[PDB]
Amino acid sequence: ASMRPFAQSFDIYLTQILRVLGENAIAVRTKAMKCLSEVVAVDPSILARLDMQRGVHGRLMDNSTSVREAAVELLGRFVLCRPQLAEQYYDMLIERILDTGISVRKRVIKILRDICIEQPTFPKITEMCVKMIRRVNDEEGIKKLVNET
DNA sequence: TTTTTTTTTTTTTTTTTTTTTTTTTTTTTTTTTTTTTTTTTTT
Structure with a gap:
């Protein structure tokens, strides 16, 4: 089989x-982002190819809250999985708190809570x-979530 | 009869897409007015 063209x-x-990621329908881009995630x-050693890098950055700055929360969810799961090597994505993550939706804010807060529980002695606590x-x-x-957290 | 994990069902939240609905002039109609037009009365 490893000889065959499959x-x-x-x-x-x-x-x-x-x-697909550059297209003109929202649902399609959301699903592309989730499947890529x-x-x-x-x-986890696939966030290396430069095209995937530029893709996830672009979609992180995209103009619709759905794909934005999808992208930040990808990046958050990647950061949580690999404990170290996250000091390079923290800035682009923590920029996103101020993102004028209610999805993205809740997602970033959940990711932050899991960080602050899981691997303490991180510098940026x-x-x-x-x-x-x-x-x-x-x-x-969001108020209820922060209060209970 | 009452407790527990796993699974199953409900329900709840938050976006995106469609839907009735309010408004915004524009035009039309109809009744009111009033000025002119028409019609006897009288000094």
């Missing part, structure tokens, strides 16, 4: 999915606590 298809598949969380306390008055559901 085992060397996975590469192709990624490329195909990444052609699942792929990434299976084989104080700033994380300051920002989460800062958002205590922002909304209602």
Whole structure:
């Protein structure tokens, strides 16, 4: 089988999915992001190819809250999985608290809570606590989440 | 009869897409007015 022209298809598949990410329908881009996130969380040493990098950055800055929360969910699961090597994505993550949705804020707060529980002695604990306390008055559901956390 | 994990069902939250609905002039109609037009009365 490893001689046959099927085992060397996975590469192709990624490329195909990444052609999709620039398109003009929201649901399709959301699903592309979720499927890519699942792929990434299976084989965590795939956030290396430069095209995937530029893809997830672009979609992190995208103009619709659905794909934004999808992208931040990918990045958060990747950070939680690999304990170290996250000091490079923390800045682009913690930029996203101020993101004018209610999805993205809740997702970033959940990811931050799991960080602050799982691997203490991380350097940026104080700033994380300051920002989460800062958002205590922002909304209602978010308020409940921060209060119980 | 009453407790527990696993599974099953409900329900709850939050976005995106469609849907009735309010408004915003524009035009039409109809009744009110009033000015002119028409019609006897009288000094």
